[PDB]
Amino acid sequence: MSLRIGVIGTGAIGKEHINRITNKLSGAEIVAVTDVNQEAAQKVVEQYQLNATVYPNDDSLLADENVDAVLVTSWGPAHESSVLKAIKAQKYVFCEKPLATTAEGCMRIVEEEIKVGKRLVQVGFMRRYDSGYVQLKEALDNHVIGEPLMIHCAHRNPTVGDNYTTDMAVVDTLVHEIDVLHWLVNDDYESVQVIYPKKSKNALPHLKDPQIVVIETKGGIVINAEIYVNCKYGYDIQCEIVGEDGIIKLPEPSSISLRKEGRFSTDILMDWQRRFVAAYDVEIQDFIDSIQKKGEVSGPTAWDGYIAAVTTDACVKAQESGQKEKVELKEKPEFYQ
Amino acid sequence: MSLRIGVIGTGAIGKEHINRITNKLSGAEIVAVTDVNQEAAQKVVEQYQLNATVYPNDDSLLADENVDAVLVTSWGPAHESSVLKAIKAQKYVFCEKPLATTAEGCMRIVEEEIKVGKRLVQVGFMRRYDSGYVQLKEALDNHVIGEPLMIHCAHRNPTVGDNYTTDMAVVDTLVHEIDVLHWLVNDDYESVQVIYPKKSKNALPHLKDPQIVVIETKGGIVINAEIYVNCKYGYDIQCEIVGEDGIIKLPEPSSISLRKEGRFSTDILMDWQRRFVAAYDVEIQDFIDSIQKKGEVSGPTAWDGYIAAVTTDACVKAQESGQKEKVELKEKPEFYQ
Amino acid sequence: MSLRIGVIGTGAIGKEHINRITNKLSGAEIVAVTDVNQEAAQKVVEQYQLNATVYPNDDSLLADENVDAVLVTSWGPAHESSVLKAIKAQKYVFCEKPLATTAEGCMRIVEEEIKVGKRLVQVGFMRRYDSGYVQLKEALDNHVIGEPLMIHCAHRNPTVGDNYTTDMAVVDTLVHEIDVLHWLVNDDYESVQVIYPKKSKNALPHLKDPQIVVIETKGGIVINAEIYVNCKYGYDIQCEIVGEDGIIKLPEPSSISLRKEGRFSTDILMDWQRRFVAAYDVEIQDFIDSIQKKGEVSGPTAWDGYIAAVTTDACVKAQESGQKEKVELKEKPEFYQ
Amino acid sequence: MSLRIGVIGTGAIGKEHINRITNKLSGAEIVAVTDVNQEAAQKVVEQYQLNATVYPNDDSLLADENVDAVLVTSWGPAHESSVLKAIKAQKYVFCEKPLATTAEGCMRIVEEEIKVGKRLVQVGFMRRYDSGYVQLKEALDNHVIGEPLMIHCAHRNPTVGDNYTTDMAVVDTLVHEIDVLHWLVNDDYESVQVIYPKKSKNALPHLKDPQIVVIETKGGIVINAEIYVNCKYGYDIQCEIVGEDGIIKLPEPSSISLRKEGRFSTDILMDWQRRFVAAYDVEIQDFIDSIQKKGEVSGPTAWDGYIAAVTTDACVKAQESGQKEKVELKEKPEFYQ
Ligand SMILES: NC(=O)C1=CN([C@@H]2O[C@H](COP(=O)(O)OP(=O)(O)OC[C@H]3O[C@H](n4cnc5c(N)ncnc54)[C@H](O)[C@@H]3O)[C@@H](O)[C@H]2O)C=CC1
Ligand SMILES: NC(=O)C1=CN([C@@H]2O[C@H](COP(=O)(O)OP(=O)(O)OC[C@H]3O[C@H](n4cnc5c(N)ncnc54)[C@H](O)[C@@H]3O)[C@@H](O)[C@H]2O)C=CC1
Ligand SMILES: NC(=O)c1ccc[n+]([C@@H]2O[C@H](COP(=O)([O-])OP(=O)(O)OC[C@H]3O[C@@H](n4cnc5c(N)ncnc54)[C@H](O)[C@@H]3O)[C@@H](O)[C@H]2O)c1
Ligand SMILES: NC(=O)c1ccc[n+]([C@@H]2O[C@H](COP(=O)([O-])OP(=O)(O)OC[C@H]3O[C@@H](n4cnc5c(N)ncnc54)[C@H](O)[C@@H]3O)[C@@H](O)[C@H]2O)c1
Ligand SMILES: O=C1[C@@H](O)[C@H](O)[C@@H](O)[C@H](O)[C@H]1O
Ligand SMILES: O=C1[C@@H](O)[C@H](O)[C@@H](O)[C@H](O)[C@H]1O
Ligand SMILES: O=C1[C@@H](O)[C@H](O)[C@@H](O)[C@H](O)[C@H]1O
Ligand SMILES: O=C1[C@@H](O)[C@H](O)[C@@H](O)[C@H](O)[C@H]1O
């Protein structure tokens, strides 16, 4: 008897999920969708031969009782609203970043969940399910390299749309690191600070590319995170964790080596879609399996999403001040941990 | 409406499949099993909370009509018998290597299939579904390195059981290469030959380890294939294809690099189970999806399995003669291709 | 007819040079030494079967006319004095870092050289002669990766003496980067800034280890330079230059790969002495050959050394202020370039 | 007081040596040359401002007493004659491969040396002085990977001259491996055998390219050695030694990594001249230093050269017979070891 899932946001990424759940994963089906382009959602449903209802809005869909869990995978700002609803409707919710565009927005969502007694919110920070990132977790948890001291890492795009704005860097993009980093080291972010290098020819003038973001944790770990979205050569995520006694570092994507025309190369991906495809599959399957066999979700908590929002805040603050902004994080509710 | 699958052979590897199909893959369920330790099969069924019938034998199970496809995943020699049956019962069959322990055995199976009009037999040579091996396929199909000329490759075990016999090398072990190699280059094996290096201390005396196997194709491609199952350091599969104008080579398994105590290392797997887990998942999902949306299976053909058997023959022949045995392959039936 | 060289400073490093010049290089001999442990100097002349005079001081030695060039390779602070002398004595001088312990000290040395009409001072920043660092230079000079934007690099020791002080990091250690970096990118250092991560267990408490040093150039290039001298695992120099369209990165020292006990490793050096041995050989040979066939020295200029001193200043300033210190560099005299 | 060296053979390679000795190495000078294009030799003495005599032949030059050691670096076949002479003239001789074009030719040279009481012959197999090959030696000598069992290695040219003949492969080319391999493992070659893969488009029809050469040692070690001189992509030497418990493998030449246009590459050399430049320098310096401080040469012995010749024989034999030729090696004279 499978888990019945409603998808709010029949967009590109919601479509990818509907697809994996329908044709790749196990133990769940899509019985309900609503888009804001109601027609788009109706086209999706035929596209993937679903047996699902098409609601005009989230309320209508959250109403429905043959649906016990929802994907919030719509336009970013409309997330918060949909989530709080689903929490009160006492259905399970998986929410693609952002959790809520604003920190307080996130906060409201936390408070709701602490009421409804259990863990219904999982945030879609898939990096935690990537095999490389997991091996990193595993190593640290094993003390392999002793006390973590600094972290060097980079997040690079070949290019971006004209739509890409100097803040999206720390908002849309650096957000995954912001989650995964503290996840790994199990520390909280004390301060952030931003430094702008010589703007790049491959970037449009209304955009500050690259950027560097230094971040300190409570413990004393220092992170420098390159973000460069017009690097032209490829899409490439890099993370090296220097420890007291050793260094561990994230792998490249698997690739066949080539010897030709003077060079000994491996392949670099050009399409962010490819880098994490398996992390998504694992992430979602975990939502499912986790629910059916535990009555609560498991991955990145509602809290973890708040931590993101605050920190993104401190970042855009530092973006404008070029000054060492503080990151004021609220009490971590006993509820969590 | 999902595909209903019967498993003949509730052993370790049949269990792994029952597990992935039940808890990992999409669009299929297990509705029928039979082991030869009838009790084992009954224990499996409870283990994985199945809703399946437990038959005393394959016949009983092939009888059943709520089953439209079967996994032959039992003890190696009992494969052939189960398969021919399932072909006449006009159900779909996925068969873990071997197809049939003897070449002619394979031949009977081919002839049956050519009668029953379509493609119901898929052989479990999962390497073809490994991402690395696929990139290799892709490159060649693209002529990247021009005409393939030689192949160097190795198949290494940390150790083996006391049960491991000097022929199992070319029978149980080198079989995957034997499939994947010709698959890649799209050529047939002309001759084989075996050379025994200085026997290894890590090997028991009743066993000849390592061994080298040279193989020529019709076209003129030369392959040398190390096989060494007591290499002590790990489990490691390596394949490099030298071409007219370039070289491509299989990747290592993804791994975090480490800098510690004087060395800059990556991880090597110790457990053959891990190396290919994802190839299995993909392989089986392909059986399923392929069936439901095409009315025929897709992967390694019944023919491809025969090719294996013949070639394993020529190998054990060369094993005893240390002489350049010929590989006499029969007409490839138009049926295939 | 070979170049006749006087060595002031018959210490460990001066000895290494006397050795390479006598038994490794071409076209020069040692005809004069002076130490401050006058006896230590006698012992050497014996050690290496020299045919050289032993002066009581630099003046005595600079007096001598059968000597046309000198190595200043004595205790750090005693450098300045010896060099100014040799400039007025109109002999050629190769000076191991530091040029002068203080910036002004360096300045006096520049002014002297601009008088004496030509180039007699070469500073021993050997990194510029390392084959890897040279390939980097070459690439950039060829625009391979377009406009350089950021640089990530690290300088790591296994451990240090009790003698090692929190400033030595930027004074003795980071100095090589400080030279090579701007050498490479052909830009001047605008600001520096220092950030102290969580002090390391492997470091004595009177010492701040690791440290991070951010540096901006006039042009807009940003550098973050890890310095960590108690990293325990090895001695390791790393440098990655991110450009507009590409990334180039310094190589590891050549090493045989090993597959054993679960890991696939390369070697890491433990002994800073080994990392650059060939850069020294090249560096010195270039002093020699450059002199005999050009009447002037070639490598890192007296100026380049001053640039170091100022920048080391700004660093120790930032060390104490944890504030973004400015680096005020004087006019670059036409003399140079 | 330096070593006085006569060069017989003022050709391209003899010139390279004259150059390194004059302008790179330590403790030796060139005081005597003879070519067969007597004029070519005059031009050289000028080219390199030597202070040397120009003899009309080797006899004239071996006569001379201000010369205590000679480079035999002339046309291949003329080697033997020049060497036997120099042995009787009781001068030291360094001889670039071949030692003698024929095995017996080598034999005569051995017998002469055993008479004249000591070691005066060093054969120019520079691979033994390459830093990578040395690390390999070192590892094995340390048992790191236990008993060596198989060796995979390859010797690849981008292309060759029209002058290149199907035997030159095993005669001019594979000769370095033939020396270094047995050097490393300290075993003698029992049999050889040759296998011709599908001839390559990049090769002229009068030439069989690639070739594979299998070789067994007395002990039981098996080697397969690819030789492919029209591989188009670069010049590349590769050697992997599989052992009882581990695998060690020769490094790539040092190179800066690049990230650009979708690929993550290192450089591959195109010019055999570059691959070993430092091994030559070391090799020759060792001849010098070894002589002056030991009264005998050190590197690859006259014997080692004979071993080459015999084995080259067995190879060209196998080249024509495509049959497993034997390698009949004579008693190793106590003289050696
Ligand atoms: N391209 C990228 O790199 C990444 C994109 N994403 C995420 O995907 C989400 C949106 O982008 P895409 O799905 O790729 O394209 P998209 O912008 O087309 O998705 C937004 C969709 O949801 C919308 N929507 C918002 N609230 C709704 C509501 N209450 N009811 C119905 N529809 C609603 C629209 O219907 C729209 O089609 C965002 O969370 C974004 O951050 C995820 C990872 C990275
Ligand atoms: N360990 C290894 O490296 C590999 C093992 N395998 C394959 O797995 C198969 C068997 O090994 P495992 O499953 O791992 O262990 P296993 O030997 O326990 O599996 C054999 C099972 O099927 C048997 N059997 C044979 N014919 C039967 C029939 N008609 N009805 C009921 N039962 C029958 C037994 O019941 C037995 O439990 C073979 O095909 C083997 O080649 C696959 C890849 C590699
Ligand atoms: N550029 C480089 O790669 C490099 C490398 C090593 C050292 N150095 C610098 O050079 C210095 C020397 O290092 P070392 O390893 O020889 O140390 P060491 O302890 O082995 O000896 C230093 C020597 O210099 C002598 N000395 C001091 N002042 C002198 C003077 N005015 N005249 C003649 N001799 C004098 C001492 O008697 C001593 O023998 C250090 O301070 C160091 O910072 C630079
Ligand atoms: N061991 C190595 O790494 C190595 C490297 C290069 C060449 N070699 C061998 O050495 C040989 C020389 O190569 P090269 O590059 O100088 O060729 P090259 O064409 O540039 O010149 C060969 C020279 O040897 C001279 N010569 C021939 N016989 C002579 C004799 N009896 N006495 C004096 N001079 C004589 C010729 O006049 C000519 O100048 C080749 O046959 C080659 O196989 C060995
Ligand atoms: O968060 C993400 C997106 O915003 C961004 O567009 C992708 O390029 C990133 O790699 C992904 O992690
Ligand atoms: O075929 C196989 C098994 O027989 C063998 O036992 C495994 O070690 C191999 O790697 C696998 O490919
Ligand atoms: O000059 C230096 C030393 O003082 C220091 O000890 C080493 O770490 C540096 O590598 C070297 O370049
Ligand atoms: O002696 C040799 C040459 O004849 C040949 O051309 C090169 O391929 C080899 O690398 C070199 O060792």
CATH of the domain at A54: 3.40.50.720
Report the candidate in B333, B335, B305 with the shortest Cα–Cα distance to residue B94: B305
Q: Which residue has the tokens 């596209």?
A: A47
> Are B225 and B283 contained in the same domain?
no
d(CA C286, CA C86): 19
Q: Which residue has the tokens 């119901």?
A: B120
What is the whole-number distance in angstroms between the Cα of residue A272 and the centre of ligand 5?
A: 7
What is the whole-number distance in angstroms between the Cα of residue B16 and the centre of ligand 7?
A: 55
Terminal-to-terminal C-alpha distance of chain C: 31
> Are C32 and C93 contained in the same domain?
yes
> Are D178 and D221 contained in the same domain?
yes
Helix (H) or strand (E) holding B123: strand B121-123
d(CA D315, CA D293): 39
Helix (H) or strand (E) holding B310: helix B302-321
Q: Which residue has the tokens 């430049």?
A: D277
Q: Cβ distance C99 to C80 under 8 Å?
A: yes
What is the whole-number distance in angstroms between the Cα of residue D102 and the centre of ligand 8?
A: 19
Task: Point out the ligand 5 atom lying closest to the alpha carbon of residue A127.
Answer: 12
**Beta strands of chain C (E only): which ranges?**
3-8, 28-34, 53-54, 69-72, 92-95, 121-123, 148-156, 189-195, 211-217, 222-228, 236-243, 247-249, 257-260, 263-267
The β-bridge relationship of strands C222-228 and C211-217 is antiparallel
d(CA C309, CA C102): 6
Nearest CB to C198 within list A149, A199, A224:
A149
**Domain finish residue from D266, D292, D321:** D266
User: A320 CB near a chain D CB, below 8 Å?
Assistant: no
> Are A324 and A189 contained in the same domain?
no
- Please indicate whether, in this complex, the C-beta atoms of C262 and B233 are within 8 angstroms of each other: yes
Backbone angles phi, psi at D47, to 5 degrees: -25, -50
Find all residues with CB under 8 Å of D122, minimum gap 6, and list them: D92, D93, D94, D95, D287, D290, D297, D298, D299, D300, D301
Q: Which residues of A touch C232 (CB under 8 A)?
A: 244-246
Q: Which residue has the tokens 């590892």?
A: D139
Report the candidate in C152, C140, C184, C272 with the shortest Cα–Cα distance to residue A249: C152
List the structure tokens of D304. 């080692």
Residue D246 CA to chain centroid, in angstroms? Answer: 28
Q: How many domains does chain C have?
A: 2
Residue D167 CA to chain centroid, in angstroms? Answer: 17
Closest ligand to the CA of B155: 6
Report the candidate in C139, C132, A263 with the shortest Cα–Cα distance to residue D254: C132
Q: Which residue has the tokens 């199945």?
A: B50
d(CA B32, CA B8): 8
The Cα of B242 is separated from the nearest Cα of chain C by a number of Å equal to 21
**Residue to substitute in B53, B74, B167 for testing ligand 2 pocket (most ligand atoms within 8 angstroms of CB):** B74
Range of the domain at A208: 144-266
Q: Which residue has the tokens 């969590």?
A: A336
Query: How far, in Å, are C129, C278, D94, D281, D282 from residue C25 at the CA level?
Result: 15, 11, 21, 11, 12
Going by the DSSP 8-state scheme, the letter that residue C326 receives in this structure is B
Q: Cβ distance A227 to A160 under 8 Å?
A: no
User: C60 CB near a chain D CB, below 8 Å?
Assistant: no
> Are A294 and A284 contained in the same domain?
yes
d(CA D300, CA A262): 32
The Cα of B257 is separated from the nearest Cα of chain C by a number of Å equal to 9
Task: Point out the ligand 7 atom lying closest to the alpha carbon of residue C275.
Answer: 10
We report the CATH number of the domain holding residue A166 as 3.30.360.10
Find all residues with CB under 8 Å of C13, minimum gap 6, and list them: C73, C96
Residue B230 CB–ligand 6 contact under 6 Å:
no
**Domain finish residue from C211, C233, C266:** C266
Instruction: Output the CA angle C267-C269-C274, nearest 5 degrees.
Output: 130
Terminal-to-terminal C-alpha distance of chain D: 31
Nearest CB to D197 within list B200, B201, B220:
B220
**How many CB atoms sit inside 10 A of residue C313's CB?**
18
Residue D105 CA to chain centroid, in angstroms? Answer: 17
d(CA D216, CA C321): 69
User: D247 CB near a chain C CB, below 8 Å?
Assistant: yes
Query: How far, in Å, are A164, A229, A230 from residue A160 at the CA level?
Result: 6, 6, 7
**Domain finish residue from A206, A236, A266:** A266
The β-bridge relationship of strands D53-54 and D28-34 is parallel
Q: Which amino acid is at C277?
A: V
List the structure tokens of B208. 């000849």
Q: How many CA atoms lie within 13 A of B1 on its CB side?
A: 5
d(CA D9, CA D256): 37
List the structure tokens of D101. 């074009």
Helix (H) or strand (E) holding A288: helix A277-292
> Are D1 and D78 contained in the same domain?
yes
d(CA B116, CA B120): 9
- Please indicate whether, in this complex, the C-beta atoms of A257 and B246 are within 8 angstroms of each other: no
Task: Point out the ligand 6 atom lying closest to the alpha carbon of residue B229.
Answer: 8
Query: How far, in Å, are A237, D122, D269, D277 from residue D273 at the CA level?
Result: 38, 21, 9, 7
> Are B14 and B156 contained in the same domain?
no
Q: Which amino acid is at A188?
A: D
User: Contacts from A171-174 at CB under 8 Å and sequence distance 24+?
Assistant: A171/A98, A171/A312, A171/A315, A171/A316, A173/A227, A173/A229, A174/A213, A174/A225, A174/A227, A174/A312, A174/A315
d(CA A5, CA A21): 9
- Please indicate whether, in this complex, the C-beta atoms of B261 and C233 are within 8 angstroms of each other: yes
> Are C215 and C260 contained in the same domain?
yes
- By CB atoms closer than 10 A (0-12, 13-18, 19+), residue A53 is middle
> Are A137 and A4 contained in the same domain?
yes
> Are C239 and C137 contained in the same domain?
no
> Are C139 and C203 contained in the same domain?
no
Sign of CA dihedral A303, A308, A311, A316: negative
B183 Ramachandran zone, left/alpha/beta (phi>0; psi -120 to 50) = alpha
Residue of C140, C239, C254 to mutate when probing chain D, most D C-beta within 10 A: C254
Q: Which residues of D touch B195 (CB under 8 A)?
A: 214, 216, 222
Report the candidate in D96, D111, D36 with the shortest Cα–Cα distance to residue D280: D96
Q: Cβ distance A145 to A139 under 8 Å?
A: yes
d(CA D17, CA C336): 37
d(CA A5, CA A68): 6
Closest ligand to the CA of A79: 1
Give the residues across from C94 on adjacent strands: C71, C122
Q: Which residue has the tokens 């003239």?
A: D89
Give the residues across from A267 on adjacent strands: D263
Helix (H) or strand (E) holding D54: strand D53-54
> Are B272 and B252 contained in the same domain?
no
- Please indicate whether, in this complex, the C-beta atoms of C248 and D256 are within 8 angstroms of each other: yes
**How many CB atoms sit inside 10 A of residue B211's CB?**
26
List the structure tokens of B173. 């072990």
Helix-strand-coil split of chain B, %, nearest 5: 35, 25, 40
Find all residues with CB under 8 Å of D238, minimum gap 6, and list them: D152, D153, D154, D155, D156, D249, D250
